[model samples]
Target: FKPEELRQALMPTLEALYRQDPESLPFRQPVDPQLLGIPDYFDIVKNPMDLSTIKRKLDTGQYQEPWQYVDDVWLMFNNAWLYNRKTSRVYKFCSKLAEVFEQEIDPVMQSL
Candidate 1:
């Protein structure tokens, strides 16, 4: 698919993800390590990603391929999965979004 087509596909996927339980609160924006008092967050995560950042990048034409956007969304979900305990609500929320995103985007990916 063209870049614009990829963007079109990803935006709705993002919105669908945001509509899930808890409203994707934890993954909506950049994680502020200092604000949250988690000084070791970046040290552990290495790379940070979020839904808002993904949307902004998509809107600004920063992505050239469908997989580029897919990777960023995975990165966001994986960061939470890696940092938070499996039993934690945050981890569960992240998992829910990740699973929904995968299901929602599968058709678009197959078309690409």
Candidate 2:
């Protein structure tokens, strides 16, 4: 598929995560350890990512291919997995969002 189509395909996929669940609020913006009072977030998470960051990258045309964009979402998921306890809402939400992401992306990738 064309790069433009890849961009088009990704925006909706990102949006799907935003409105997927109420827990998505935490992921809408970058992590703020100081404000949230998590003393060791940066100590654990190396490449922090969020929906807004993805939106900016998409708008700026930073992704050359579909997998690059998908990888960023996975990066966000991986960070969530790394920083949150398995029983935490953030971790549960990450699992849900990952499933949603896969469902949304499969056909988009195949059609390309």
Candidate 3:
């Protein structure tokens, strides 16, 4: 999709994500420095893939596929905005959903 189309598609999802209380989502728990390791690793990593690798992958119709993008959305939701909300049993449910996205959906997309 074009930049504008991409932005329009993601805007509503972003708005809904931000509008809701973190506690409502199970994966929206406090960041565990120990479990997660460096709190800002993902944020600090300027490049997720090397430039040549990214271009090559895109050329090959590989990089940033739909499921990977969705996985990124989950990462942003859980790590960036929702970490550390003291809600009951929500994190477990959220974590499970996140796992399915990460382990099953994302890997399948990457393999394809």
Candidate 4:
């Protein structure tokens, strides 16, 4: 997808997820240290491959944030806009777009 298409597909998802039931969000952590007798260490890393059956897995046993992006959207944009300096202001627009997209997710993030 173009950056714009990617943004459109994703921003809507953030709101849907926030509105989803806590039960609906049955987060799933992979090979959990907390489950492996290491409760002192909370391993919060998300492995993206774990979501092949994401929608079906929502309320399933994987209760460690069962869904996560394969590659974060903001991460990609940061790279796409890297060293974007030029004689024109297109790079500036990229920065502004990044801020706008990121801010879209802020409320969703805060609820969690």
- Tell me each candidate's TM-score: 0.92, 0.92, 0.35, 0.35
> Residue 44 lDDT in model 3?
51
**Which stretches of candidate 1 lie above 4 Å from their native place?**
21-23
Question: What's the lDDT for residue 86 in model 4?
Answer: 45
Least well predicted 10-residue stretch by lDDT in candidate 2? 1-10
Tens digits of per-residue lDDT for model 1, 55-79: 8999999988888988998899889
Off by over 4 Å in 3: 24-65, 74-112
lDDT of 3 by residue, 17-57 (tens): 33345533432333444585666644654333222332233
Number of the top-ranking candidate, with lDDT as the measure: 2
Clashes of each: 0, 0, 5, 10
| Candidate 1 lDDT trough over 10 residues, lowest sum | 1-10
Q: Which ten residues in a row have the lowest lDDT in candidate 4?
A: 22-31
Regions of candidate 4 where Cα sits further than 4 Å from its true position: 1-10, 13-71
Tell me which residue pairs clash in candidate 4: 27-62, 27-63, 27-64, 27-65, 27-66, 28-62, 28-63, 28-64, 28-65, 28-66
Measured on C-alpha atoms, candidate 2 has an lDDT of 0.89
Per-residue alpha-carbon lDDT of model 4 for 44-84, expressed as tens digits?
Answer: 23222211243333323322331233134343334324423
